[model samples]
Target chain A: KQCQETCDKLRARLVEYGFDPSRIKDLKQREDKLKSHYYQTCKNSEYLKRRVTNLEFNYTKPYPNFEASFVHGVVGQLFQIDNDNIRYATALQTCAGGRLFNVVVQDSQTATQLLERGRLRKRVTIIPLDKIYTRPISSQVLDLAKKIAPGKVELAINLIRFDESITKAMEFIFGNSLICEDPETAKKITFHPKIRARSITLQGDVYDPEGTLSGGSRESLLVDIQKYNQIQKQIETIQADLNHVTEELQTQYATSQKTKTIQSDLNLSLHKLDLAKRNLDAN
Target chain B: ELEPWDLQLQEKESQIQLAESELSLLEETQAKLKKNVETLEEKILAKKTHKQELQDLILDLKKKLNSLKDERSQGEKNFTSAHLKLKEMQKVLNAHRQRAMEARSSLSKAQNKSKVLTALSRLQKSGRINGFHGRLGDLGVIDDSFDVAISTACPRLDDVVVDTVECAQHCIDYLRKNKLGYARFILLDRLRQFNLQPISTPENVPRLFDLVKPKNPKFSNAFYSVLRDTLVAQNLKQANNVAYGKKRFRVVTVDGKLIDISGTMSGGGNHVAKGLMKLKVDDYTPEEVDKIERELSERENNFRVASDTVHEMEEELKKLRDHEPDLESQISKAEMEADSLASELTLAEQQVKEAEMAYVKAVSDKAQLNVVMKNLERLRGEYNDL
Candidate 1:
């Protein structure tokens, strides 16, 4: 198995290097390239934020009493995880499941008003905060999860911040799920009978207490959160690689300068010999 | 103090003597150094000259390769041109051959019309048919101007003449048995009734029979009966005047327009009827036949030249194509030689650069020694002054 795995790894490495071994020589070039690329990607994420809002929703106020505050917008856009918790992006998105795209409203009447006159371009699930139900994990299950995974686990709702008006809707989505830092922690905490809740890993793998595990590639509901983190990581990796190349060349530069100084000294000695020979001839 | 000055002077003298001896050694060393630098300079020059030669050789090789490529390209162009030209020539020759073949067949068809005459002549000569004369048209000659009038008036021009009705009967039997088609016969015995005198016309137009210069006077009655008081007129109006104004005579105009005694008009149009009878010895003159043969021969010559040119060009193309491999091989060899020469030139250039560097170093060393010698001379002068 090791031999076969070695061959597989070799092929994977070859693909990773683009089948060209000489790419390592252009480490600094790649740094500049990734820097430019990351900057443009940041630009796009900012641009796509407004563009995605346009694509994801249609809004209207058909009645005099209706206000912007009556509707809380798409659930995915209503809350955001802090920058330090970016590694939980896929996990949070996976934990929220299909409810991430549901529209949140103050009440069922407002939801009905929007559905009738909102001129919605596409179908969407609407969550009326007053009518929705959410069951938070009991204290006993939380204590068990904390005891099982310690600091590596947390309720998904606690990881994100949102306006208080949509608290019921956000809880209905994130209330029952836990995010774990690793799949092992997620598996143990999710499968424990004391907890009996859905759990997901930072890598977006889902582990349910019902004994089902699922995940391979995960999609993010928020574009900027995923792309911004990926580009930032890539830029840092390229910068570090460039720095390593520069460090490797430092000794060579020093040696070259040393040889240059040695040559200058030799020339100085030769000049001295010339002066001595002239003095000898004169004597 | 005097003794000390003397010793000091002696010391200075010994030092000067040793310095002079060292100067002699330095001069010899300088000479050798000069020779060594000169030798290095020559070596550098030789290396540079050889490099230039190699560069020139490469240029020549490149030029030769380019010329061969040009030749091959031109050969291909010429081959294409020749092939197209050959196709065009073949088309023209085919047309000419078709025309010539049709002309020969037409001539043969015209000659085949004489087969009946050949049969009758053969019968007469062999005594199979007695008292047989030749065809009425061949037995007489008429003026060229009256040829149309005579041939038009005398329908018997195509008929055979015989001495008696028995001879005509014999000829008819011979023709019927041989299935040689048909020919009209003019019996001299049946023409005895045409001994009637000629009547005078208002315009005095000549009698058609009097215009005939017959080959035999004995066949006069045959000619007379065939013509039978048909008068020749200079024009259609004159013929009408003579035929209708004076008498109901059979009249014919010089241009072959005709009016019968029955008052019917015939034969006057854009196509004046001609060649109705052969009064000349042969259908075509020798000169005309010779001219046709000459034209055909010329066309044949042109066709042959065109064909030969195409063949020669084809051979030339083949030869050029055959030499293609040789030329390509030479170009290949030349390219290899040029590559090696380029490398050799590069090495030569490097060698020359090294030699020049050594020469420069040697010259610098020599200049420094000269400076030392100048300094030593100045110091010795100071010593002498002391």
Candidate 2:
């Protein structure tokens, strides 16, 4: 009676946090029904008593091994990948090619770890980038995690620092042009003479050193142009890497779908597999 | 060794212990069952509470839905009215455009007519002569002294002389036929003066040399010729003034038409100006042409005010539309929840009744067990007494 009272109090606390309390009522009823069934069927003998004891214990600890083994089996081979300086796409591809997927943060502990890492690095964590990539992979995963474990794997970043880098990169690419964050300004940029001319001129000869027509042979100008070209090259390289990773990730996702199919097939053959394993163990 | 009393005592003791054990077991089972029932009841109560809350939410949602429908309809109506107003304003704008065009054309014609009238008046004023000179024969005026004197008195008097002479003869004829004394004498005197006639032949007419010879013997010929030239010039001046005046009046009439047309065109311009003045940003329904302009600051201000109102209304409508559905749904959900809660409350009430019945049954059963225990004890006592 005391145990049941404690259980009920605990359940009420859980219900306060949005959990449905009806489930607890159902559980209690089911327990009572099982007890009634056990008492009705058992005989009044020492053997029956021993059997009843065993049954009670079994009822109390129904999924002890199953829970432990299931968790260990699923996550035994899972490992974290720590890359130092990989491009966004390369990191994604590296994870995919290893028959692994981007790490999904499933709980507050994982989210805290990710956020701490981002704080230490003074940048957004890899987890959020992985999440961003994952969205294009499957909306189901995103929605599932959001519904089931809200804010568990939220993106963590110092936006000011991140945006600064983005702004710097943008400035480099656009040559110090002030691009407004408004639609009108963006529209105006389309007709801007400098942007139009630059776009047309650079589209065909992005990396051609001889294409530039600076009137001076000064090393400073040459160096500046060289630096500009390098930035462009870096952008191109990043884009190429992104494309490659995107393709690989898509393939990996397809393979994962096939793995699910295989998993379903294995579930159908579980008895046979279990028998074979038993035979192997005996041998 | 075969003592019946001892056997009876041992049997009674055993029976007593058996009853005690059964009672204890029953009590323990009862406690456990009671705890289970209490837990189940608590859980059921929690579920009912949650269901009630959900029902409330559903009612709110229903209310919101109804409100959204209303807002949407209102928005549609507003849009229709605004569209109509915009069309009407456009028509007014078109009319104003036509009026402005007509005003411009009329102004041009008025300017042209004013220029023509000014030129004609200038020509007429500049073409006037102060005097004239001409030989008696060269001049269109008659060559008699009376005629010359009449013509000299008013260089442009030919019509006057002709009318006077004709009137004098008509009066003399009337007097002579009637034989009136005084009137006849007056008419004959008028006829003697009117006897002056134009020379039909050169033989009957005095020569210009003769007419001027006695006037100035030293420069008689020169004088005669100059006088004749002067008289001719004067006559021409008078004639030209009469002709010019007539032409000028005609031109003035034409000029007046120009003025009228110009005034009409100006009226059109005034209409355009009036229309422009009436053109208000508030009058513009859906779209304002100068909305993007910063000058026409008053118009801009009006536009801003109107646009803000429209935008605010739109936003309000949108918000209302959004909130209406939510409120309606909420109201409906609340009603549904209330119903569900009421039903659950009824079920709880039934459950309480059932619990009360079970409790009564348990109490009765416990009483029966106690009675049985007491009976066994009484049987032991009886055996002991025997």
Candidate 3:
């Protein structure tokens, strides 16, 4: 309201200065905007008549203003001044209000989430990276173990168990009468991947009771893939066995029927033989 | 010159030679038929023996089938028994497991009443208290005859028992420090012992002390304050009579309802143990768990054994099933063979009959030929005489 009063005074001054009073147009006439003629005069008396353009289209939201918060900075000094820090700081604050750009943050918990550091918790909140398999399950691992070692499934299972128990022996050996004190037995057992005890994964991490970093040589992804292939092989073998049995069962009837046909043929042959014998005896 | 009669005789002699040859051939045919008949009869006997043997084999196979059936059923029975044992063992194991689950919590849980009381007692024991025992209820038992009377006498049997006053105070401080819940207590040190003269009383009116058995016989005297002056009454009237009687003894009924010497009365509702009469262990014994597991394993073995028996039986049954067809086919084959053998025997018998008929015809032919020869010879002789 006060700006308009000032604007009225400026227009009246313009009238005294010989612009037609009827030619004066209100800035408010078109959607709270103004005529540049009066606006230039009201804004800076120097801007009047020398500039000489009057249109309602002229306003604060212009290309220069867009440039202030665009690739440049929110401050008008972006192009006009050489200060970079001030320009960089102002644009971040200004860019949000511009509606020209968008910024939103949702949940993501990769290494990046920690790098970014954010969350939502009622009293407490927790988020973790989505789970994925880095290793095969026990059975597949066992299959690989069997391939690598002599023992099949049982050995695989034993090897898996050994892997779990290896740590126990590493830190503290078991008190088994035969295997506990016998280094030879332990070495022999460890020789087979399947029956070999679970060794402690080398970890310098604090969670490990060993308190020392000892890296482990675990199955590689290739080995895991090999296990998968073995799984397929075993599946195929199992299916083959089942099919073989099914074939046998199917052929049972076929064979039984074949036996019947042969028997009937034998009977016919005997009858023919009898007929031949009669012909031979025919005096 | 030769006579005509001599020539005629020579002709007769030639006729005789032809007749004799025919007679000999007929006799050979008769002899061959007789031999064939004997051979056929022997063959018939052999066939009969073969038939009998085959029949015996069929009977034997049938008997074997029956035995297989019986054996299969027995195997099934064995399987059932094993399975039943497994079920029963599993049920027991399940129950034991449930009990272990339940008792583990109740007994092994850190703050059971017994443990708490013991903890308190341990804290309280020493100096003035000197020592601590279990709850008052734990140390004593009540007879069935007077369960109510003693239970009424001691309402706080679940209390921690100690020997001293300051000991009780120490226990309270311990509880507060640990924030244990509230508990009742008893002080053996504070208890007054009873001294009474032995007296003969009638059977109906008995002393209540005799009904209660304190584990510690020394504590037997300690329990006297509660039951020393009291008499157990069989009924309310008897108790009431005793309370107001000439002796004016304090009386309690069998239901634990009591009538004081002052005639104050108590009880008629349900009651817990009068005193702790049984000992309790604080934790689940590991061996017991192992025992249940072992038993479970044993039962499983039994089940497997029976199951294996059943499996074997089923295999036998299948074998029998396979064998049944074989047996049937065998019987059929044997019957067919027997039919052929029997028919051969019949044919042989018929051949023997034909041979005998031929022999009879040959005998007749022989006689006729012999007579012709004899007549010719007689004719020749007459010619010779001429």
lDDT of 1 by residue, A1-283 (tens): 3434434544454454333324433543554455455445544453333223322455557688777787777776678778787777778878876567677777766765665566644445577766565578977888888988779889988888888877888888888998998877975787666788888878766665432344321134455644444555666776676566667545434443543544334333433333334335542
The residue pairs found clashing in candidate 1 are none
List the lowest-lDDT window of 10 residues for candidate 2 chain B.
B258-267
Q: Best candidate, TM-score-wise?
A: 3
Model 1: runs farther than 4 Å from truth?
A: A1-55, A218-283, B1-386
In order of listing, the candidates' clash counts read 0, 44, 15
List the DockQ of the predictions in order: 0.00, 0.00, 0.00
lDDT of 2 by residue, B1-386 (tens): 57787676887788776776777877786676576557668867886778767766665565557666876897879966765664565344433433333334445433433443343234335653111121122223233433332222222211111122223333323334544311101111111222122322211322222333232232232223222212111212222221133221100110111001001000000111111100031122112323312223443244335544554555566556446535654564455446545655665666666765676677667675777678677766866786
Off by over 4 Å in 2: A1-283, B1-21, B32-297, B366-368, B371-386
**Tens-digit lDDT track for model 3 on A1-283?**
3434444554454334443312222211331122222222222321121111110011133233232221111111111112322222222222111111111112112212212222211011111112111122244544443454342122211211123312222111111111111222322333344443332211100011111111111122222222333343445554555455545445445433543544444443443333334335544
List CA RMSD, all candidates.
47.2, 42.5, 41.5
**What docking grade does candidate 3 earn?**
incorrect
